[PDB]
Amino acid sequence: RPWQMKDLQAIKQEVSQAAPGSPQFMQTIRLAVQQFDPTAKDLQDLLQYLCSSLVASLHHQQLDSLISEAETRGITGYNPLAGPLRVQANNPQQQGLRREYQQLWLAAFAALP
Amino acid sequence: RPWQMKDLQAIKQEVSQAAPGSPQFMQTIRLAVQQFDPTAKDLQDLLQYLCSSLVASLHHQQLDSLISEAETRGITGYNPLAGPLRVQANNPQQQGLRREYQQLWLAAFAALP
Q1: Where are the domains of chain A?
Q2: What is the CATH number of domain A5-111?
Q3: Which of A71, A66, A49 minimizes the C-alpha distance to A112?
Q4: Which residue among A59, A108, B16, B34 is least enclosed by CB atoms within 10 Å?
Q5: Residue in B with minimal Cα distance to A13
């Protein structure tokens, strides 16, 4: 049950005025992420739709650092012999990795301003 | 029939002008809750969506007070040998607990000011 075009259009329109990482944007994006239960691929699509290449790159770097610390510590469900967290989160049998990816994503995007 | 994006986006759209505790806010919240019959999970999602973190924290303080009072006094179908009302309202076969939690939710929201 992935999102459709209308959901993305509403998500972008409702937060057109606000700035990335504002409380309003964080509310709406967090609700979307917690409601649709998407993988990393869909999150990348959503970010490309919402913010430009500059904000995309900044979030990419911040999320790289956050994932770096998180999975360098060691995580309950992460096994580094199978692939990067971006790929484990895309397997529907690793929901723990998917939820960790979602939370790192939202925190990274909130850490912009 | 848990609410999708469109329902919650509307709810926030018409709960934007008014402030918590005002007649309009409570009217809309009560209608939504009485219609969709949401558990504690969906209620917490809706609250995080609507108002700032400060208002959510205030509401949860009031809700903890109400729930503690009710559990001391006694609930019709509350059996504490399995988990708190908080967790007993997530089981779909406990309609009484769910409706009681919804009513305490609405009361705690109405008593913020």
Answers
A1: 5-111
A2: 1.10.375.10
A3: A66
A4: B16
A5: B9
